[PDB]
């Protein structure tokens, strides 16, 4: 069974006294007419918990707070017995559902006791109220504040909540309210600011009474349903295969230095392979190598052996290291090598290969069945530069799909922004990339792949207005969305993400589109009267036979 939070959940947010004033204050609060849970048990503590108990003779006893409360770490406790409250943060072995018959501590239906809790800035906050009730199994419709009683400067991590013997429990939410203070300083009334458009009007005007008129209160923004990115082409990669396969392998005597520039690096090809014999990159991670841009890539096809494979690298010296290729102290590069002798050598012996010895090259005559410790393996290492020239050795660019006729966040080759895309009759020039308005803003773009001209329109936006007769007379309000098509208004004001008091006007049986915008909440009539609440474009609204009507003045 669930209960509606009738005008409940109000507590003093600040230790300040105010007489005859309204104060629009923002903090965590339990919404007006929100849903609370009844129980007859472990619960979470998302931000705060509003707790109520409706019993006859103090049957309820205590509570257990904390995160897991298994005594494996900190766990707060609150206990009560014979008009005495014992409070602690000590760690006893807490039972699964404890019942009755150290960094700090403390000591001390017929009646309704209310408890609301929270934690901010490493402190424990309690606001409480005791109310005289005598009725059964319901939440009385009444307004009363919660009074701050205790503070515990613990700063314990609390996410779990327990009760020990009505179990009305409700969570606190970050909502703004318009408090009302009387002369005595007691909170006399309050308004949840997201209950309904009338609440919005009260919040803006800072009043509990609003007279006849149209009151523009909230702005209205459509949000991108998703995001898209586009890019010029699939790829113009380098011929990394040419310096990679190396059937006609390089000579170690003069290590082949290859300059690579102006490509889209196939870093993924030998990075996402998982089928490579020798990889070990030092100075740059092997994971995000596919998203980087460098000026000049030097790939050296070098000759290595079974034992000298790791010799030519920072941290190891050796003959191949000393004579042919010597790694520096802070090389920024990777080691890549195909390690097999079935291909590295020929049948009968690869005598043509030579390793520098009088440095002058000693022949690297690997046998056809040469041992692993003597097997040659083509060794390749890539070094990247940052010269006074454009860096063109770059990773491939991921392009998403072109989704049109929706509010989306796009990224067209760095010309980016948020808008709604529509194919245009506008024709560009075969060298043109994007269009521009008189006031120098982006309006039209060319999709890099299909070479079509699209129109970019701002995501729907505008302001909300509330049309209402004086609350002194009536409590019905008609809402007007400005300069928008009626089709997208409910989801654009987040229809699903609103309380039903808002959803009743997010959509409706009476949606009227005017020149000034789309009006919800007043059925249009075909008569004409001396218009009283002016809407715009000749349209005005009033309260008549009863409901609100929209007509031409």
């Amino acid at each position, epitope marked *: 069974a669930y209960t509606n939070s009738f005008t409940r959940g109000v507590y003093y947010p600040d230790k300040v006294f105010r007489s005859s004033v309204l104060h629009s204050t923002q903090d965590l609060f339990l919404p007006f007419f929100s849903n609370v849970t009844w129980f007859h048990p472990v619960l979470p503590f998302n931000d705060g918990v509003y707790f109520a108990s409706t019993e006859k003779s103090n049957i309820i006893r205590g509570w257990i707070f904390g995160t897991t409360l298994d005594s494996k770490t900190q766990s707060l406790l609150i206990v009560n017995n014979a008009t005495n409250v014992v409070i602690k943060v000590c760690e006893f072995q807490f039972c699964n559902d404890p019942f009755l018959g150290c960094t700090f501590e403390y000591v001390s239906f017929k009646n309704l006791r209310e408890f609301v809790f929270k934690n901010i800035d490493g402190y424990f906050k309690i606001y409480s109220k005791h109310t005289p009730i005598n009725l059964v199994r319901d939440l009385p419709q009444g307004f009363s504040a919660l009074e701050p009683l205790v503070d515990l400067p613990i700063g314990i991590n609390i996410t779990r909540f327990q009760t020990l013997l009505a179990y009305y429990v409700g969570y606190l939410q970050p909502r703004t309210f318009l408090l009302k203070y009387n002369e005595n300083g007691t909170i006399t009334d309050a308004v949840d600011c997201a209950l309904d458009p009338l609440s919005e009007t009260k919040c803006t005007l800072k009043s509990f009474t609003v007279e006849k008129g149209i009151y523009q209160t909230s702005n209205f923004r459509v949000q991108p349903t998703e995001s898209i990115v586009r890019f010029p082409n699939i790829t113009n990669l380098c011929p990394f295969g040419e310096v990679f396969n190396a059937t006609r392998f390089a000579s170690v005597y003069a290590w082949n230095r290859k300059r690579i520039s102006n490509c889209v690096a196939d870093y993924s090809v030998l990075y996402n392979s998982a089928s490579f*014999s*020798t*990889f*070990k*990159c*030092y*100075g*740059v*991670s*092997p*994971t995000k190598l596919n998203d980087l841009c460098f000026t000049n890539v030097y790939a050296d096809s070098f000759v290595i052996r079974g*034992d000298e*494979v*790791r010799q030519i*690298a920072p*941290g*190891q010296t050796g003959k191949i290291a000393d004579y042919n290729y010597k790694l520096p102290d802070d090389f920024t590069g990777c*080691v890549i090598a195909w390690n097999s002798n079935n291909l590295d050598s020929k049948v009968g012996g690869n005598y043509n290969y030579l390793y520098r010895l009088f440095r002058p090259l000693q022949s690297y005559g690997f046998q056809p069945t040469n*041992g*692993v*410790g003597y097997q040659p393996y083509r060794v390749v290492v890539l070094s990247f530069e940052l010269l006074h020239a454009p860096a063109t050795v770059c990773g491939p660019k991921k392009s998403t799909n072109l989704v049109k006729n929706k509010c989306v966040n796009f990224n067209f080759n760095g010309l980016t922004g948020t808008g709604v895309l529509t194919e245009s009759n506008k024709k560009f020039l075969p060298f043109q990339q994007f269009g521009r308005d008189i006031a120098d803003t982006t309006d039209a773009v060319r999709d890099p792949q299909t070479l079509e001209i699209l129109d970019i329109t701002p995501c729907s936006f505008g302001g909300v207005s509330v049309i209402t007769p004086g609350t002194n007379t009536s409590n019905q309000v008609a809402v007007l969305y400005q300069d928008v098509n009626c089709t997208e208004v409910p989801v654009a004001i987040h229809a699903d993400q609103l309380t039903p008091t808002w959803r009743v006007y997010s959509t409706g049986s009476n949606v009227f589109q005017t020149r000034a915008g789309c009006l919800i909440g007043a059925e249009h009539v075909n008569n004409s009267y001396e218009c009283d609440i002016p809407i715009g474009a000749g349209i005005c609204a009033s309260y008549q036979t009863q409901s609100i009507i929209a007509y031409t003045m």
Partner: nanobody, 126 residues
Framework: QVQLVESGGGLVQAGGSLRLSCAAS????????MGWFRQAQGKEREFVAT????????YYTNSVKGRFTISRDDATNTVYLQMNSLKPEDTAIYYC???????????????????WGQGTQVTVSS
């Protein structure tokens, strides 16, 4: 002197799952990116697989492609060699070793590890 200590061998037949802890003392540990090796008798020093300091990357050879997975530890400063699907010839002396910290990734030459431990020997009997 670095005492690279190993334990976690087993006499179990195909299917039993065991771990290979490589504990060292007197030296930097969390920063040391260390990978596991073995010395199969009838073969020379060989590479099996490797892990890195943040548990960032892995590289598995084609004889332990699905058999071995690697996962580290933080508090007791140790890396394990997880394993499954034992092979009859797989029994040998298993030597995890240590190498000065690498920026990322792995070096797979069995000589690339310089400080060598004592070893944990798994057993497969066929």
């Amino acid at each position: 002197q670095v005492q690279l200590v190993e334990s976690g061998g087993g006499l179990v037949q195909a299917g039993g799952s065991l771990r290979l802890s490589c504990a060292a003392s007197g030296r930097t540990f969390s920063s040391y990116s260390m990978g596991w090796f073995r010395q199969a008798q009838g073969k020379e020093r060989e590479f099996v697989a490797t892990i890195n300091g943040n548990g960032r990357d892995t590289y598995y050879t084609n004889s332990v492609k699905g058999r071995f997975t690697i996962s580290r530890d933080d508090a007791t400063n140790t890396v394990y060699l997880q394993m499954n699907s034992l092979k009859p010839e797989d029994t040998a002396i298993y030597y995890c070793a240590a190498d000065k910290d690498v920026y990322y990734g792995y070096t797979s030459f069995p000589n690339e590890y310089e400080y060598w431990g004592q070893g944990t020997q798994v057993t497969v009997s066929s």
